């Protein structure tokens, strides 16, 4: 059937779609988008796939025995189907039992993640609002991306920096001589955004490729691996041993002292503490000068190459662009801190195309905003007019808010006391947990340790669109529909604010699935508080209310038509903006425009932190050895290979791994691909296409061989997001519940360690990992990850 195209959008971009034979016929890019992503070929598979959640289900023994069931069985995949009313009655009864027997400290419902775009249907917000109307629970602070970075920068530059707007791309293209990409791959990571992604940044990357060819701009990539960006631009690379970056920075600062290359004016007028740091680099107290000769065998860079780099950074106007990966390792606050110190010693902060950036690889930061106000959202909290059924604040002496990544450690040892960014934290006694809009069995580390911690839980509830590993390890499960099976509203470009889009319903929700609004409105009915929850409005009434409010705010500078007209058009345009320079104000007059630090200047040495007395984070940057390190680091005698689980090029974390046809374009021999170097492959007799087994003293998995020159000796890669699918010793689905079971597909976190960054931020350290690998020789199993549950009938 040939009809008019409809409008919509997602984290991958804005689209245009047409329907035929009652199904979505085809996807086309939105007109204004000139650089779409290849992942546009996987969209249709996300809605029509084999891992779809058909109806509500409850785990066998839990259905039969309630909170007194055999928890050792989680993971075997056997479930029983039930009606919506029965499933909701059970859910509520469980919340009753826990508030009564234990109280608020025994429930954890605050985990967040990459939920789909949409101002009205946002899943995590609907769950928390309804559950709150029942009773309180435990919350968290932080995230898995910039955990350490966001905790340290406020002390140095006076802000988190990572999520702020930066210097405009044009100003950079016209003034920068050298652009340093340190642990940064923007060509690959710019394909997605927080809101509908405009992809504007790709036009500027194209202009950059020109400058590189003409020989007008020099780009240097400091990375242990050859990146996608380096290949696209045709620029150079500087190898560095993984995790040894800090020794290089210290050596560079040593050259600048000896041969007077640092800007003395900027230091004296814009910072504090330089004179307290010098002694360390110079070795006047500890006994060792941090010279290039010293750093060389550690970082893997020759003394003369280090001196050459130093002269280059002061030769012209230099612009630093740091990624996020480097701070996701043990002591991750150090490289971020020491970087800011180098930028200060150079003294080009505040100039167009000079200084340092921590985010030009995220949601098109660098393209100027229109200046318009964006639309509001559905509330995730109770309204001033209401109260919950219970409402107790007794946490039995424990903390009501914990560091995001310490949640497993708390289930394992309640009542323990930990240090945390200048305060004390006490772990609560958790018995029940709720998940919506996130996938814990993908994002956390150490699968086999997580299995032991789960044995101590009484109830686990999950709402998702597909049968993910998290659902596989739950007690009650509820089905939701995709954004293409409902109506919503969203802004175009998280930082651009180019306009406002319309997310129109394409087809009817499949099977027994429901929209997140519907799911929690029914729950509110059980509690007898339906109207209060919804504010007495439906889907379209809510959307119309949010548009009108946005139009009200923008009344002064932007014109907008009425809702009826807007919906028919499917889009409303805002405009372009003017260029801007990041730290120009503080530069012009630091007396008038100080920073948010305690003194108002840049702090190379902080009195505040030094006062804490922490052993693994002191008054100034230092080099400290890690627990597991390659190329001569501790532990490389038994497990020589470094494992990096860098973000995927053809997925958004775990989202899209379910798209059948599209996935089969990169899968190898049924498994997820492992990228291996020629030298290491030869030493083990491995060839392309062979099934490989990667392991260590904590876990084991299977994967497909891919030999590549982009990987140096001693390093392998397996992308984060590959679905966890364990099997027994006989290759069965059910045996997958066993502690120590082999993963038939290849999830990297099956081999990772659960450690805290340092006493300062207590964040994720996933990249500190050592392993070993061999050619798999045993009976080959079938993948259990994508085929859904075993249905048991009573
Ligand atoms: N080893 C290693 N570990 C890492 C990382 C690493 O570099 N290495 N990187 C990490 C970071 S940066 C982050 S962002 C993280 C990602 O996991 P996550 O947030 O759960 O998103 P996700 O994985 O995409 O899963 C989101 C789930 O949400 C569901 N969903 C999405 N939208 C909807 C919706 O509208 N309603 C409902 N009911 N659910 C919805 C998805 O189906 C998915 O299962 O994993 C970190 N961990
Ligand atoms: N296509 C796609 N886009 C996305 C995402 C996605 O899932 N898919 N997710 C997004 C979110 S969640 C966030 S957190 C972000 C990821 O940033 P980042 O960790 O820096 O990318 P990274 O790729 O994990 O790492 C970048 C580089 O860091 C190098 N590296 C890693 N460790 C070190 C080290 O110690 N020393 C040095 N010098 N460099 C190191 C890596 O080689 C990689 O090139 O990317 C978003 N964009």
**Domain final position from 562, 589, 606:** 606
Query: How much distance in Å is there from the Cα of 636 to the middle of ligand 2?
Result: 24
End-to-end CA gap in the chain:
44
Token reading at 342:
């180098």
Phi-psi region of 64 (alpha: psi -120 to 50; beta: other; left: phi over 0): alpha
Token reading at 450:
């997580």
Name which of 724, 653, 658, 659 is nearest 473 in CA terms.
724
CA-nearest residue, atom 38 of ligand 1: 464
Structural domain contains residue 295: yes
CA distance 583 to 596: 13
CA-nearest residue, atom 8 of ligand 1: 645
Is the CB of residue 240 below 6 angstroms from any atom belonging to ligand 2?
yes
Ligand 2, closest atom to CA 721?
7
- Using CB atoms within 10 A of its CB, is residue 275 exposed (0-12), middle (13-18) or buried (19+)? exposed
Q: Å resolution of this model? A: 2.5
Structural domain contains residue 436: yes
Please count the other Cβ atoms lying within 10 Å of the Cβ belonging to residue 354.
25
CA-nearest residue, atom 10 of ligand 1: 144
Name which of 783, 781, 751 is nearest 767 in CA terms.
751
CA-nearest residue, atom 13 of ligand 2: 145
Sign, CA dihedral 464-470-472-478, equals negative
528 and 544, same domain (yes or no):
no
Q: What is the CATH number of the domain that holds 675?
A: 2.40.40.20
Ligand 1, closest atom to CA 645?
8
Is the CB of residue 324 below 6 angstroms from any atom belonging to ligand 2?
yes
- Residue 249 in contact with residue 240, Cβ under 8 Å? no
Is the CB of residue 148 below 6 angstroms from any atom belonging to ligand 2?
no
Task: State the total domains in the chain.
Answer: 4
What DSSP string runs through 480-497?
Answer: B--GGGS-EEEEE-TTT-
What DSSP string runs through 385-426?
Answer: T---SS-----TTS-SEEEGGGHHHHHHSTT-EEE-SSSEEE
Phi, psi for 401 (deg, rounded to 5): -140, 125
CA-nearest residue, atom 22 of ligand 2: 646
Task: Identify the nearest ligand to the CA of 715 by its number.
Answer: 2
CA distance 243 to 332: 9
CA-nearest residue, atom 2 of ligand 2: 189
Q: What is the CATH number of the domain that holds 16?
A: 3.90.55.10
Token reading at 49:
């796939």
Measured between alpha carbons, how far is residue 390 from residues 207, 386, 393, 399 in Å?
A: 60, 12, 10, 19
Measured between alpha carbons, how far is residue 284 from residues 276, 288, 290, 323 in Å?
A: 12, 8, 11, 34
- Residue 372 in contact with residue 495, Cβ under 8 Å? no
Residue in the structure block whose two tokens are 């608020």: 104
CA distance 290 to 254: 7
Is the CB of residue 436 below 6 angstroms from any atom belonging to ligand 1?
yes
What DSSP string runs through 109-146?
Answer: ------PPS-TTT-HHHHHHHHHHTT---BEEE--SSS
Ligand 1, closest atom to CA 465?
42
Is the CB of residue 188 below 6 angstroms from any atom belonging to ligand 2?
yes
- Residue 502 in contact with residue 491, Cβ under 8 Å? no
Q: Which residues face 424 on adjacent strands?
A: 419
CA distance 115 to 122: 7
CA distance 326 to 243: 8
530 and 544, same domain (yes or no):
no
Name which of 56, 52, 57 is nearest 660 in CA terms.
52
Residue 37, CB half-sphere, CA atoms under 13 Å: how many? 27
- Residue 148 in contact with residue 332, Cβ under 8 Å? yes
26 and 90, same domain (yes or no):
no
Ligand 1, closest atom to CA 328?
7
Measured between alpha carbons, how far is residue 363 from residues 150, 163, 354, 482, 653 in Å?
A: 18, 10, 21, 23, 16
Sequence ranges of the binding site: 145
E strand segments, 512-574: 571-573
- Residue 733 in contact with residue 743, Cβ under 8 Å? no
CA distance 644 to 768: 9
Determination method here?
Answer: X-ray
Is the CB of residue 323 below 6 angstroms from any atom belonging to ligand 2?
yes
E strand segments, 565-640: 571-573, 602-603
Query: How much distance in Å is there from the Cα of 243 to the middle of ligand 1?
Result: 26
Is the CB of residue 43 below 6 angstroms from any atom belonging to ligand 2?
no
Which one of 647, 666, 717, 719 would you pick to mutate in the ligand 2 pocket, going by the greatest count of ligand atoms within 8 A of its CB?
647
Instruction: Provide the Cα torsion 78, 81, 87, 90; round to 10°.
Output: -50
What DSSP string runs through 55-67?
Answer: S-EEEHHHHHHGG
Name which of 95, 94, 88, 87 is nearest 67 in CA terms.
94
Q: Which residues contact 530 (CB under 8 A, 6 or more apart)?
A: 521, 524
Ligand 1, closest atom to CA 113?
19
Query: How much distance in Å is there from the Cα of 190 to the middle of ligand 1?
Result: 17
Residue in the structure block whose two tokens are 């010793």: 729
Token reading at 594:
């100080």
695 and 649, same domain (yes or no):
yes
CA-nearest residue, atom 17 of ligand 1: 443
| Interhelix angle 245-258/274-282, nearest 10 degrees | 100
Structural domain contains residue 35: no
Structural domain contains residue 792: no
Token reading at 548:
């009108």
Degrees to nearest 5, angle at CA 359 with 442 and 331: 60
Structural domain contains residue 373: no
685 and 564, same domain (yes or no):
no
Task: Identify the nearest ligand to the CA of 10 by its number.
Answer: 1
Task: Identify the nearest ligand to the CA of 649 by its number.
Answer: 2
Please count the other Cβ atoms lying within 10 Å of the Cβ belonging to residue 393.
8
Residues, the chain, total? 794
Query: How much distance in Å is there from the Cα of 441 to the middle of ligand 2?
Result: 20
Ligand 1, closest atom to CA 721?
23
- Residue 453 in contact with residue 412, Cβ under 8 Å? yes
Q: What is the CATH number of the domain that holds 303?
A: 3.40.228.10
219 and 361, same domain (yes or no):
yes
Phi-psi region of 511 (alpha: psi -120 to 50; beta: other; left: phi over 0): left
Query: How much distance in Å is there from the Cα of 440 to the middle of ligand 1?
Result: 8
Degrees to nearest 5, angle at CA 609 with 606 and 615: 125
Structural domain contains residue 500: yes
Q: What is the CATH number of the domain that holds 76?
A: 3.40.50.740
Phi-psi region of 623 (alpha: psi -120 to 50; beta: other; left: phi over 0): beta
Token reading at 445:
């580390």
Which string of b and e fits 469-487 if b means at least 16 CB within 10 Å?
bbbbbbbbbbbbbbbbbbb
CA distance 659 to 655: 9
240 and 345, same domain (yes or no):
yes
Task: Identify the nearest ligand to the CA of 144 by its number.
Answer: 1
Q: SS3 letters for 237-261?
A: EECCCCCCHHHHHHHHHHHHHHCCC
Ligand 1, closest atom to CA 752?
1
Is the CB of residue 775 below 6 angstroms from any atom belonging to ligand 1?
no
752 and 675, same domain (yes or no):
yes
Is the CB of residue 404 below 6 angstroms from any atom belonging to ligand 2?
no
- Residue 304 in contact with residue 161, Cβ under 8 Å? no
Q: Which residues contact 538 (CB under 8 A, 6 or more apart)?
A: none
CA distance 717 to 645: 6
CA-nearest residue, atom 19 of ligand 2: 325
Which string of b and e fits 42-52 if b means at least 16 CB within 10 Å?
bbbbbbebebb
Phi, psi for 94 (deg, rounded to 5): -70, -35
CA distance 739 to 41: 38
Is the CB of residue 228 below 6 angstroms from any atom belonging to ligand 2?
no
Measured between alpha carbons, how far is residue 374 from residues 228, 330, 493, 496, 543 in Å?
A: 34, 38, 10, 11, 14
Structural domain contains residue 44: no
196 and 250, same domain (yes or no):
yes
Please count the other Cβ atoms lying within 10 Å of the Cβ belonging to residue 584.
15
Task: Identify the nearest ligand to the CA of 188 by its number.
Answer: 2
Query: How much distance in Å is there from the Cα of 161 to the middle of ligand 2?
Result: 17
Is the CB of residue 363 below 6 angstroms from any atom belonging to ligand 1?
no
Is the CB of residue 111 below 6 angstroms from any atom belonging to ligand 1?
no
Is the CB of residue 633 below 6 angstroms from any atom belonging to ligand 2?
no
430 and 405, same domain (yes or no):
yes
**Domain assignment of residue 431, given as a range:** 52-143+380-486+512-534
Query: How much distance in Å is there from the Cα of 324 to the middle of ligand 2?
Result: 6
E strand segments, 598-698: 602-603, 641-644, 673-676, 691-696
Query: How much distance in Å is there from the Cα of 145 to the middle of ligand 2?
Result: 9
Residue 86, CB half-sphere, CA atoms under 13 Å: how many? 9
Query: How much distance in Å is there from the Cα of 442 to the middle of ligand 2?
Result: 16
Is the CB of residue 497 below 6 angstroms from any atom belonging to ligand 2?
no
690 and 666, same domain (yes or no):
yes
Structural domain contains residue 777: yes
Residue 259, CB half-sphere, CA atoms under 13 Å: how many? 12
Residue in the structure block whose two tokens are 């800090």: 246
Token reading at 237:
């690379």
755 and 621, same domain (yes or no):
yes
CA distance 442 to 681: 28
CA distance 463 to 479: 6
**Domain final position from 574, 594, 626:** 574
In the chain, breaks (C-N over 2.5 A) are found after none
Query: How much distance in Å is there from the Cα of 115 to the middle of ligand 1?
Result: 8
Phi, psi for 106 (deg, rounded to 5): -100, 10
């Amino acid at each position: 059937n040939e009809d008019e195209w409809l409008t919509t959008g997602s984290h991958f971009g804005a689209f245009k779609m047409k329907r035929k034979n009652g199904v979505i016929a085809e996807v086309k890019p939105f007109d204004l988008d000139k650089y779409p992503t290849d992942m546009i070929n996987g969209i249709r598979g996300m809605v029509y796939n084999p891992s779809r959640v058909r109806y509500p289900m409850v785990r066998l023994d839990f259905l039969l025995k309630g909170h007194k069931s055999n928890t050792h069985q989680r993971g075997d995949f056997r479930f029983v189907r039930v009606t919506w009313d029965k499933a909701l009655t059970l859910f509520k009864h469980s919340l009753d039992e826990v508030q009564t027997q234990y109280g608020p400290s025994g429930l954890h419902a605050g985990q967040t993640g990459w939920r789909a775009t949409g101002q009205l249907h946002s899943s995590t917000s609907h769950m928390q609002r309804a559950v709150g109307m029942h009773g309180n629970y435990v919350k968290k602070i932080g995230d898995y991306s910039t955990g350490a970075g966001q905790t340290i920068l406020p002390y140095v530059l006076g802000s988190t920096e990572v999520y702020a707007q930066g210097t405009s791309w044009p100003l950079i293209l016209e003034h920068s001589d050298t652009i340093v990409l340190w642990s940064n791959d923007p060509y690959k990571n710019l394909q997605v955004g927080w809101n509908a992604e405009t992809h504007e940044s790709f036009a500027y990357l194209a202009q950059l490729k020109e400058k590189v060819k003409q020989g007008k701009i020099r780009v240097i990539s400091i990375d242990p691996v050859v990146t996608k960006t380096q290949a696209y631009l045709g620029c150079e690379q500087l190898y560095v041993n993984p995790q040894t970056d800090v020794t290089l920075m210290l050596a560079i600062a040593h050259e600048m002292i000896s041969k007077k290359l640092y800007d003395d004016k900027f230091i004296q007028g814009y910072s504090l503490g330089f004179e307290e740091f010098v002694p360390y680099v110079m070795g006047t107290k500890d006994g060792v000068a941090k010279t290039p000769e010293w750093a060389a065998p550690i970082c893997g860079v020759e003394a003369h190459v280090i001196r050459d780099l130093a002269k280059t950074l002061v030769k012209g106007r230099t612009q630093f662009m740091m990624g996020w990966c480097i701070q996701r390792q043990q002591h991750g606050e150090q490289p971020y801190w020491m970087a800011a110190v180098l930028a200060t010693m150079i003294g080009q902060i505040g100039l167009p195309g000079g200084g340092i950036s921590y985010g030009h690889h995220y949601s098109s930061i660098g393209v100027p905003s229109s200046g318009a106000a964006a639309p509001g959202a559905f509330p995730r909290n109770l309204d001033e007019n209401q109260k919950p059924l219970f409402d107790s604040s007794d946490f039995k002496g424990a903390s009501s808010t914990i560091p995001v990544a310490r949640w497993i450690d708390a289930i394992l040892e309640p009542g323990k006391t930990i240090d945390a960014n200048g305060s004390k934290v006490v772990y609560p006694d958790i018995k029940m947990m709720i998940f919506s809009g996130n996938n814990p069995w993908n994002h956390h580390q150490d699968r086999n340790r997580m299995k032991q911690a789960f044995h101590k839980l009484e109830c686990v509830v999950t709402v998702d669109v597909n049968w993910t590993a998290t659902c596989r390890f739950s007690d009650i499960v509820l089905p939701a529909c995709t954004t293409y099976e409902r109506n919503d509203i969203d802004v175009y470009g998280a930082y651009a604010n180019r306009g406002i889009l319309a997310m129109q319903k394409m087809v009817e929700p499949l099977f027994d699935s429901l929209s997140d609004f519907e799911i929690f409105t029914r729950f509110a009915a059980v509690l007898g508080k339906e109207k209060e929850y919804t504010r007495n409005m439906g889907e379209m009434e809510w959307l119309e209310t949010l548009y009108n409010e946005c139009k009200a705010a923008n009344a002064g500078k932007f014109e907008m038509p009425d809702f009826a007209t807007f919906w028919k058009q499917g889009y409303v345009h805002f405009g372009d903006g003017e260029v801007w320079t990041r730290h120009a104000d503080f530069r012009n007059d630091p007396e008038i425009n100080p920073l948010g630090t305690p003194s108002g200047l840049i702090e190379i040495f902080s009195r505040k932190i030094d006062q804490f007395g922490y052993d693994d984070c002191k008054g100034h940057p230092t080099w400290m050895e890690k627990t597991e390190r390659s190329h001569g680091g501790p532990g490389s005698d038994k497990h020589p290979i470094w494992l990096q689980s860098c973000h995927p090029d053809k997925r958004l974390h775990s989202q899209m791994c379910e798209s059948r046809e599209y996935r089969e374009t990169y899968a190898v021999n049924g498994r997820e691909p492992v990228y291996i170097s020629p030298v290491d492959a030869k030493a083990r007799g491995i060839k392309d296409g062979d099934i490989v087994r990667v392991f260590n003293d904590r876990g084991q998995l299977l994967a497909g061989a891919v030999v590549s020159d982009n990987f140096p000796k001693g390093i392998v890669r397996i992308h984060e997001g590959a679905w966890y699918g364990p099997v027994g010793k006989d290759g069965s689905t059910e045996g997958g519940a066993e502690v120590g079971a082999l993963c038939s597909y290849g999830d990297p976190n099956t081999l990772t360690l659960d450690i805290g960054t340092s006493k300062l931020a207590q964040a994720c350290s996933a990249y500190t990992c050592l392993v070993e690998f061999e050619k798999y020789q045993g009976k080959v199993p079938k993948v259990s990850s994508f085929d859904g549950p075993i249905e048991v009938e009573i």
